[PDB]
Design a protein around this ligand. Structure first.
Ligand SMILES: NC(=O)[C@]1(c2ccc(F)cc2)CCCNC1
Ligand SMILES: NC(=O)[C@]1(c2ccc(F)cc2)CCCNC1
Lengths: 156, 39
């Protein structure tokens, strides 16, 4: 299969036509996505098979072929870019200043950008192009708009 | 069966469209990975 680094669409042929259920990042031979996109199922890349390696429903993350590789973090000050990959649409970078999700266990960055459900797994990047987290797990605020957490795993 | 298709490189775009606000929200994270607003 294609192991080249980059952003990939996660597709299915189970439903009507070819449907995009999410997005992910290939880095250092490992495919990273959100748990709710694949529910931990195996993936296909051409003729090759990608088997899950690590996952966690609470963090809402999963890695394939190896351990989670992404460890860059939002610095808490600078603007970032959502590299949105919407269903049937070209990859597009959107710049934004993240807000904050304050929890009983600490704070996390959050991006107030609204996209179709099948955009889950799109990477959020810093100015060096490093992936600081994935887009697609968050909350709906008073005005009905969507705010996603900047979800990052841990590199062992 | 799910499959992947390449969609692009991961690179910062100089002069990309700048949008979205920066809300500071009190949230809770449950065992199922669902975020919710705390009031
Ligand atoms: N302080 C943090 O970055 C954690 C966190 C996770 C999610 C969240 F919405 C806020 C905080 C805390 C628990 C485990 N490490 C991550
Ligand atoms: N499923 C959706 O349409 C929502 C969503 C949007 C973007 C995303 F990446 C994941 C989920 C979820 C909350 C309500 N409406 C938006």
């Amino acid at each position: 299969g294609e192991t080249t680094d980059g952003v990939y669409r996660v597709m299915t042929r189970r439903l009507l036509g070819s449907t995009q259920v999410g997005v992910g990042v290939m880095q250092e031979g490992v495919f990273h996505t959100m748990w709710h996109v694949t529910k931990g199922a195996a993936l296909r890349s051409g003729e090759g098979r990608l088997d899950p390696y690590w996952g966690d429903v609470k963090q809402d993350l999963v890695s394939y072929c190896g351990p989670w590789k992404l460890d860059a973090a939002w610095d808490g000050l600078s603007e970032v870019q959502l590299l949105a990959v919407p269903p049937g649409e070209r990859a597009k970078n959107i710049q934004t200043l993240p807000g904050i999700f304050k929890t009983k266990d600490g704070d996390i960055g959050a991006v107030a950008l609204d996209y179709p459900a099948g955009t889950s797994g799109s990477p959020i990047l810093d100015k060096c192009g490093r992936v600081i987290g994935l887009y697609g797990n968050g909350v709906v605020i008073k005005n009905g708009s969507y705010v996603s957490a900047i979800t990052q795993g841990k590199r062992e | 069966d799910m499959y992947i298709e390449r969609a692009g490189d991961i690179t910062w775009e100089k002069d990309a469209e700048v949008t979205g606000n920066s809300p500071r929200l009190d949230v809770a994270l449950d065992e199922s990975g669902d975020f919710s607003l705390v009031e």
